[PDB]
Write a protein that binds this ligand. Structure first.
Ligand SMILES: [Zn+2]
Length: 255
């Protein structure tokens, strides 16, 4: 699978029939239809002990991986019951600044979207957690092109070293607090992984406030390659799934 005309999102259902399921992601967030939910408990992003390990080009994005062998960086509160551990983050982005996000807001596409992936510790490991409807919590943060994000530049500066599929580099001591906007106001809905295997195991938490990154920062994302070393060059751009039917779901606002 991939994002090309021959292997992209419109093909995924043949190998992953859940692609046409009842709780697929991403979705369009209609700001007028989302309802404030006063019952949402406060959201808790506890990243002060986060331990990053490595950055990897997996052929569809780059992932920054964390040590999740104890409760260091965790997400709690909001719509969540219990404790979700940070395991990785990655982005989705466009070939052009007018596209790249997976979620949309009143059909507005952002230049990119950050996904901070967490798993429910009650299931003991990530592989078990993805088999549960409440297994994962993904924090989604929109990127718009404007002012540079200083907390992103350490990621930007290592991308030259992982240009092609299967390349990795040590990425210790990275603080994911520097990727957050000021406000933690969010929307939330039940959904899925946005890449195969498209498992319906995600509580999505999408922040309303985007972060600003510079044109030069997102230009460097678009210099990555989908391909392996020594294969024909395919720029890693437009690695986003389009919005999926909402079906029988309600998007809740924290604000
Ligand atoms: Zn993602």
């Amino acid at each position: 699978w991939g994002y090309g005309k021959h292997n992209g999102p419109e093909h995924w259902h043949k190998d992953f029939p859940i692609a046409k399921g009842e709780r697929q992601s991403p979705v369009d967030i209609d700001t007028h239809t989302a309802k404030y939910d006063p019952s949402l408990k406060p959201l808790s992003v506890s990243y002060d002990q986060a331990t990053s390990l490595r950055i990897l080009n997996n052929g569809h994005a780059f992932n920054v991986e964390f040590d999740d062998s104890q409760d260091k960086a965790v997400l709690k509160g909001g719509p969540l019951d219990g404790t979700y551990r940070l395991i990785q983050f990655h982005f989705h982005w466009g070939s052009l600044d007018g596209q790249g996000s997976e979620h949309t807001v009143d059909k507005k596409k952002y230049a990119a979207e950050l996904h901070l992936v967490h798993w429910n510790t009650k299931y003991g490991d990530f592989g078990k957690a993805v088999q549960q409807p409440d297994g994962l919590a993904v924090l989604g943060i929109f990127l718009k092109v404007g002012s540079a994000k200083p907390g992103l530049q350490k990621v930007v500066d290592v991308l030259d070293s992982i240009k092609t599929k299967g390349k990795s580099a040590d990425f210790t001591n990275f603080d994911p607090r520097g990727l957050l906007p000021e406000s933690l106001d969010y929307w939330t809905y039940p959904g899925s992984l946005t890449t195969p295997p498209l498992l319906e195991c995600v509580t999505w938490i999408v922040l309303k406030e985007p972060i600003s990154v510079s044109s030069e920062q997102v230009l460097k994302f678009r210099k990555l390659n989908f391909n392996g070393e020594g294969e024909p060059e395919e720029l890693m751009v437009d690695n986003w799934r389009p919005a999926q039917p909402l079906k029988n779901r309600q998007i809740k606002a924290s604000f």
